[PDB]
Amino acid sequence: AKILIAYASMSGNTESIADLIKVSLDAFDHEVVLQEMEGMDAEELLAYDGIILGSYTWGDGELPFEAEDFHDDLENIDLAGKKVAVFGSGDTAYELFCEAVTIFEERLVERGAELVQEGLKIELAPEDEEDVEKCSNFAIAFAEKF
Ligand SMILES: Cc1cc2nc3c(=O)[nH]c(=O)nc-3n(C[C@H](O)[C@H](O)[C@H](O)COP(=O)(O)O)c2cc1C
Ligand SMILES: [Ca+2]
Ligand SMILES: [Ca+2]
């Protein structure tokens, strides 16, 4: 086991970002598991060397209902030594664009994880050239940390 991508997606935008990151991480002969974070016991993260969380942002910059349980679930695990990163899909029409990226970044650092880079912030779906290149650069820099 190596790198885990746990994502929360409702309309598919964050899921599409998770798919792009995994494919890049595949090209480096890493072991990349792709999972949804809902109903996922947070204990599973300790089997991995790297962990990449991903979530969309819901009302008033709050985590979606599905991700707050997993976020609170992280309260009781030591992530010391785990190299982590965060991504998310939001909409700049809101004041708190991709607050979920900041929320999960603080929580992972709050539990001893080594945050290797600033989170990836995509608007809506990664359905154009520079969004795909944003994901491609983010995933490669994470692989350079390994
Ligand atoms: C009711 C509602 C509230 C939202 N609030 C925010 C927000 O506070 N900040 C933000 O960046 N995006 C917000 N969004 C936009 C979603 O984060 C955006 O549509 C995202 O791409 C959905 O990702 P998904 O396809 O993985 O579900 C909101 C969307 C809805 C419908
Ligand atoms: Ca986009
Ligand atoms: Ca663009």
Tab-separated table of C-alpha atoms in Angstrom, residues 8-142:
chain	number	residue	atom	x	y	z
A	8	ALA	CA	-16.273	13.313	-1.335
A	9	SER	CA	-18.218	14.043	-4.520
A	10	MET	CA	-21.921	14.665	-5.125
A	11	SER	CA	-22.165	15.905	-8.731
A	12	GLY	CA	-18.946	14.328	-10.044
A	13	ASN	CA	-16.601	17.329	-10.230
A	14	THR	CA	-14.379	16.298	-7.310
A	15	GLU	CA	-14.579	12.675	-8.470
A	16	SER	CA	-13.243	13.712	-11.884
A	17	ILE	CA	-10.348	15.484	-10.157
A	18	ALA	CA	-9.652	12.330	-8.144
A	19	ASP	CA	-9.546	10.288	-11.360
A	20	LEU	CA	-7.019	12.634	-12.982
A	21	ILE	CA	-4.718	12.612	-9.944
A	22	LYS	CA	-4.769	8.806	-9.730
A	23	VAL	CA	-3.778	8.383	-13.385
A	24	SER	CA	-0.779	10.687	-12.921
A	25	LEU	CA	0.169	8.836	-9.738
A	26	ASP	CA	-0.198	5.588	-11.705
A	27	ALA	CA	2.502	6.612	-14.194
A	28	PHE	CA	4.947	6.691	-11.315
A	29	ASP	CA	4.828	3.053	-10.269
A	30	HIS	CA	2.972	3.952	-7.057
A	31	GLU	CA	0.106	1.921	-5.587
A	32	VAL	CA	-2.907	4.235	-5.822
A	33	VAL	CA	-6.213	3.327	-4.144
A	34	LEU	CA	-9.298	5.419	-4.955
A	35	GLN	CA	-12.078	5.517	-2.358
A	36	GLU	CA	-15.038	7.597	-1.267
A	37	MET	CA	-14.656	9.070	2.208
A	38	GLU	CA	-18.272	8.563	3.289
A	39	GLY	CA	-18.836	5.515	5.482
A	40	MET	CA	-15.060	5.157	5.511
A	41	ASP	CA	-13.518	4.515	8.917
A	42	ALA	CA	-10.616	6.954	9.232
A	43	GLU	CA	-8.396	4.206	10.698
A	44	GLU	CA	-7.654	2.964	7.165
A	45	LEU	CA	-5.290	5.865	6.398
A	46	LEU	CA	-2.419	4.481	8.500
A	47	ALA	CA	-1.695	1.627	6.072
A	48	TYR	CA	-0.571	4.136	3.422
A	49	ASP	CA	2.590	6.166	2.937
A	50	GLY	CA	0.714	9.016	1.262
A	51	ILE	CA	-2.858	10.235	1.605
A	52	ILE	CA	-4.676	12.719	-0.643
A	53	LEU	CA	-8.063	13.946	0.564
A	54	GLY	CA	-10.598	15.667	-1.659
A	55	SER	CA	-13.964	17.304	-1.068
A	56	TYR	CA	-16.339	19.825	-2.560
A	57	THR	CA	-17.556	22.790	-0.524
A	58	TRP	CA	-21.191	23.108	0.534
A	59	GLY	CA	-23.287	25.928	2.008
A	60	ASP	CA	-21.472	28.814	3.719
A	61	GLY	CA	-18.022	27.297	3.273
A	62	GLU	CA	-19.007	24.284	5.373
A	63	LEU	CA	-18.020	20.711	4.660
A	64	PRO	CA	-20.769	18.647	3.011
A	65	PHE	CA	-22.842	16.422	5.278
A	66	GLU	CA	-20.921	13.378	4.016
A	67	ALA	CA	-17.436	14.734	4.787
A	68	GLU	CA	-17.963	16.262	8.243
A	69	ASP	CA	-18.440	12.788	9.732
A	70	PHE	CA	-15.170	11.616	8.171
A	71	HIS	CA	-13.493	14.887	9.181
A	72	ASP	CA	-14.627	14.535	12.796
A	73	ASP	CA	-13.701	10.844	12.479
A	74	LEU	CA	-10.049	11.851	12.031
A	75	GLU	CA	-9.953	13.201	15.607
A	76	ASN	CA	-8.608	9.934	17.054
A	77	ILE	CA	-5.688	8.902	14.816
A	78	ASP	CA	-1.993	9.826	14.720
A	79	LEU	CA	-0.873	10.677	11.174
A	80	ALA	CA	2.766	11.368	12.085
A	81	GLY	CA	5.002	10.462	9.156
A	82	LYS	CA	2.191	10.495	6.575
A	83	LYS	CA	2.802	12.812	3.614
A	84	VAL	CA	-0.563	14.310	2.673
A	85	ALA	CA	-2.228	16.762	0.304
A	86	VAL	CA	-5.727	18.128	-0.314
A	87	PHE	CA	-7.814	19.089	-3.342
A	88	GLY	CA	-11.361	20.228	-3.989
A	89	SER	CA	-13.850	21.654	-6.458
A	90	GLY	CA	-15.792	24.824	-5.657
A	91	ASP	CA	-17.412	27.785	-7.389
A	92	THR	CA	-15.974	31.306	-7.303
A	93	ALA	CA	-19.542	32.650	-7.176
A	94	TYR	CA	-19.280	32.084	-3.400
A	95	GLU	CA	-17.314	34.065	-0.826
A	96	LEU	CA	-15.632	30.967	0.641
A	97	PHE	CA	-14.226	29.375	-2.509
A	98	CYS	CA	-12.992	25.862	-1.644
A	99	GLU	CA	-13.029	26.339	2.129
A	100	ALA	CA	-13.146	22.532	2.343
A	101	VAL	CA	-9.551	22.461	1.087
A	102	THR	CA	-8.501	24.673	4.002
A	103	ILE	CA	-10.588	22.685	6.500
A	104	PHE	CA	-9.052	19.315	5.635
A	105	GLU	CA	-5.567	20.846	5.463
A	106	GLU	CA	-5.806	22.125	9.040
A	107	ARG	CA	-7.230	18.823	10.294
A	108	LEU	CA	-4.481	16.729	8.688
A	109	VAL	CA	-1.797	19.027	10.114
A	110	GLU	CA	-3.656	19.022	13.451
A	111	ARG	CA	-3.007	15.248	13.582
A	112	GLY	CA	0.703	15.146	12.716
A	113	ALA	CA	0.590	14.641	8.946
A	114	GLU	CA	3.310	16.211	6.795
A	115	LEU	CA	1.432	18.538	4.439
A	116	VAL	CA	3.736	18.630	1.420
A	117	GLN	CA	2.017	21.286	-0.720
A	118	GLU	CA	-0.851	23.756	-0.851
A	119	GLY	CA	-4.218	22.365	-1.848
A	120	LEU	CA	-5.526	22.155	-5.395
A	121	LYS	CA	-8.548	24.405	-5.984
A	122	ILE	CA	-10.590	23.661	-9.121
A	123	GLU	CA	-13.753	25.537	-10.098
A	124	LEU	CA	-16.665	23.210	-10.939
A	125	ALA	CA	-15.553	20.329	-13.244
A	126	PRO	CA	-11.990	20.062	-14.622
A	127	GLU	CA	-13.418	20.257	-18.140
A	128	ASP	CA	-10.888	22.490	-19.921
A	129	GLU	CA	-7.198	22.506	-20.779
A	130	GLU	CA	-5.837	24.563	-17.879
A	131	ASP	CA	-7.928	22.686	-15.306
A	132	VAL	CA	-6.475	19.389	-16.542
A	133	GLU	CA	-3.023	20.982	-16.395
A	134	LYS	CA	-3.742	22.230	-12.867
A	135	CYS	CA	-4.466	18.661	-11.755
A	136	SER	CA	-1.481	17.332	-13.715
A	137	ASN	CA	0.929	19.744	-12.017
A	138	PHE	CA	-0.534	19.088	-8.558
A	139	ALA	CA	-0.270	15.299	-8.812
A	140	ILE	CA	3.268	15.376	-10.234
A	141	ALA	CA	4.566	17.643	-7.460
A	142	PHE	CA	3.048	15.247	-4.922
